[PDB]
């Protein structure tokens, strides 16, 4: 064929350290004072963001 | 006096930062300092600082 694969850039080799908050990473937002995890859930037809209690 | 973290952000072994909030627990008393609401008769508008939970 004659297709060209344009190679964009998303992250450098130096920025891939696991000791850093990297773009695209996945984390949970724990609340220290209330000791609860931030959550978003479907409640009554509309999604709502809240702090779940356990 | 032990300096202890009133906030959950700071834990034992961390370095204190000016402007934060802490708790002062005497070594022997084991009860944090408390600013009671008992006004002193001698001087008006002055409360009392006592070691208690």
């Amino acid at each position: 064929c004659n297709t060209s694969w344009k190679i964009n850039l998303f992250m450098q080799f130096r920025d891939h350290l696991e000791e850093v908050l990297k773009g695209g990473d996945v984390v949970r937002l724990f609340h220290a004072e209330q000791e609860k995890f931030l959550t978003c859930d479907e409640y009554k037809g509309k999604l709502q963001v809240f702090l779940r209690t356990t | 006096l032990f300096i202890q973290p009133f906030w959950k952000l700071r834990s034992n072994g961390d370095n204190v930062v000016v402007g934060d909030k802490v708790i002062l627990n005497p070594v022997n008393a084991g009860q944090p300092l408390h600013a009671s609401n008992y006004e002193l008769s001698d001087n008006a508008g002055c409360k009392e600082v006592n070691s208690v939970n």
């Binding site: 978003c40 999604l47 709502q48 963001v49 | 952000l9 961390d14 930062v17």
Partner: peptide, 29 residues
Amino acid sequence: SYEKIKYCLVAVPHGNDIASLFELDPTTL
């Protein structure tokens, strides 16, 4: 309700709006 708070958090499908940008500030030095 504006309660003491003026705005409340909510989930929005689109992400190209300027209402979804958040800055992170540190708690220590």
